[PDB]
C-alpha cells in the first residue's frame, strides 16, 4: 500500500505541485549550498576596502 501511496503522490507532484515548487541562518543556508565571500554573507566595508587596496600596485619610481 505504501508503494501505491508513493506512486499517487509522485503523480500528483508531477501533474500539478511541481509547477509551484539574520547572518547565522544565511550562513547555514550558504553552508548547505557549499556541499568575494564577504559580499555574499554580509550585506551593506573595512575588509572590502583593504582587499581592494591590496589588489592594486603602486607605480614604480627610481630611487633618489
Amino acid at each position: 500500500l505504501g508503494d501505491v501511496d508513493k506512486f499517487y503522490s509522485r503523480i500528483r507532484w508531477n501533474n500539478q505541485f511541481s509547477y509551484m515548487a539574520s547572518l547565522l541562518m544565511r550562513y547555514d543556508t550558504y553552508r548547505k549550498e557549499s556541499s568575494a565571500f564577504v559580499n555574499k554573507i554580509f550585506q551593506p566595508l573595512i575588509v572590502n576596502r583593504y582587499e581592494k587596496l591590496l589588489s592594486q600596485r603602486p607605480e614604480w619610481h627610481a630611487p633618489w
Binding site: D5, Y8, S9, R12, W13, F17, M20, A21
Partner: protein, 87 residues
C-alpha cells in the same frame, strides 16, 4: 435561500461516519481521508509557502499599480479642471 431550497446540492454531510453507517459509506470516507492524508504529508509542505509568496508578490505589485493608476487618474481630473478653468 430559494436557490438552496429548490435545487439539489452537494451534500458533504453524508460523509460523517456513524455506527449505523453502511460499510460501503465508511469505505468511501476512509479512501477520501487517505488521499487527503497523503496530500497533506507529502505535497502541500513543499509548495504552500512558495504559492503564498508568489501570490503575495503578484498582489503587492497589483496594489502598487492600482495606486499609481489612482494617482494618474486624480492628475487627469485636475489637469482637465485646469483646462476647464482656462476656457
Amino acid at each position: 435561500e430559494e436557490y438552496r431550497r429548490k435545487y439539489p446540492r452537494i451534500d458533504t454531510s453524508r460523509y460523517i461516519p456513524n455506527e449505523s453507517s453502511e460499510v460501503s459509506l465508511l469505505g468511501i470516507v476512509d479512501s477520501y481521508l487517505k488521499h487527503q492524508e497523503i496530500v497533506l504529508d507529502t505535497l502541500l509542505p513543499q509548495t504552500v509557502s512558495n504559492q503564498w509568496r508568489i501570490n503575495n508578490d503578484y498582489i503587492r505589485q497589483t496594489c502598487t499599480i492600482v495606486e499609481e493608476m489612482n494617482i494618474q487618474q486624480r492628475k487627469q481630473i485636475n489637469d482637465l479642471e485646469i483646462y476647464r478653468k482656462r476656457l
